[PDB]
Amino acid sequence: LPPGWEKAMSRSSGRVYYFNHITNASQWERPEPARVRCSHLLVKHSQSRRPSSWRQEKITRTKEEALELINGYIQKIKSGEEDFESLASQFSDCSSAKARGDLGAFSRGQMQKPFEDASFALRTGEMSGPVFTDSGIHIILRTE
Numbered sequence: 083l084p085p086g087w088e089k090a091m092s093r094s095s096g097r098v099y100y101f102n103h104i105t106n107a108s109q110w111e112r113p114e115p116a117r118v119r120c121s122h123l124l125v126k127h128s129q130s131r132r133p134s135s136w137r138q139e140k141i142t143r144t145k146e147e148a149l150e151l152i153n154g155y156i157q158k159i160k161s162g163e164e165d166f167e168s169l170a171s172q173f174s175d176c177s178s179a180k181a182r183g184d185l186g187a188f189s190r191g192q193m194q195k196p197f198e199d200a201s202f203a204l205r206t207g208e209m210s211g212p213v214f215t216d217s218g219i220h221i222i223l224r225t226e
């Protein structure tokens with residue numbers, strides 16, 4: 083299977099699913115360019131490198147509370163109840179929020195390493211699960 087993918091078994095159902103340990107993506111169905119383009123939604127927490135954003139001068143949520151927020155945004159995006167662009171614009175603690183989280187194109191050697199690795203392991207159109215860096219917790223959408 084492509085880079086990072088392993089076969090696993092569901093806790094509730096017993097059905098096979100697939101888990102990517104590089105993007106933290108998981109999906110039911112069976113699953114490198116010089117440059118990729120991604121958007122993200124960042125949720126900072128009290129242990130972030132810079133616990134401050136356009137949304138909130140002092141970010142005080144714990145890492146666990148950030149992960150809970152991230153997982154709720156993933157659920158809404160996957161259900162189609164909200165789209166990624168809209169939750170990024172509204173809720174991302176990154177300054178790219180004002181561009182629907184779009185970061186433009188980048189190559190390896192530019193981003194923090196867990197962000198880069200996840201970005202380059204996603205398929206075009208594919209969204210990560212929670213990705214952790216010193217900025218905080220991310221949802222990454224690879225758009226090209």
Ligand SMILES: O=C(O)CN(Cc1ccccc1)C(=O)c1nc(-c2ccccc2)[nH]c1C(=O)O
Binds near residue numbers: 131135175178185
């Ligand atoms: O201030 C910055 O520009 C970067 N920081 C603080 C920081 C500083 C050094 C290392 C890691 C994080 C952030 O926490 C941050 N990271 C991002 C980020 C992370 C991954 C991809 C794109 C943007 N955005 C932000 C932001 O405030 O707007």
